[PDB]
Amino acid sequence: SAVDMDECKEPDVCKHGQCINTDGSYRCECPFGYILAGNECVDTDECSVGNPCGNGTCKNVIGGFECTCEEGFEPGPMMTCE
Ligand SMILES: [Ca+2]
Ligand SMILES: [Ca+2]
């Protein structure tokens, strides 16, 4: 059999996003939290906002970000201070 070129599944296209195999092309579509650097899809710098925790400091993570509120608290995976 023969399948049309994926175009996005290639190591030089998307490589980390929800693409859309078209008839003669594709369409990279990174999720909410990622971006597109011309073809490679990955996470952006969420800590570039300003400590989403509430007072501590922000850090860059995947699907969101990380943070270290004033030592003595308990943050989360990628949400805010809690
Ligand atoms: Ca295709
Ligand atoms: Ca991030």
UniProtKB/Swiss-Prot annotation:
Family: Belongs to the fibrillin family.
Disulfide pattern: C8-C19, C14-C28, C30-C41, C47-C58, C53-C67, C69-C81
Annotated EGF-like domain residues: 4-42, 43-82
Organism listed in the record: Homo sapiens
Subcellular location: Secreted
Post-translational modification: Cleavage of N- and C-terminus by furin is required for incorporation into the extracellular matrix and assembly into microfibrils. The C-terminus, which corresponds to the Asprosin chain, was initially thought to constitute a propeptide. Fibrillin-1 and Asprosin chains are still linked together during the secretion from cells, but are subsequently separated by furin, an essential step for incorporation of Fibrillin-1 into the nascent microfibrils. O-glycosylated on serine residues by POGLUT2 and POGLUT3 which is necessary for efficient protein secretion.
Documented effect of changing G72R: Found in a patient with Marfan-like syndrome; likely pathogenic
Protein name per its UniProtKB record: Fibrillin-1
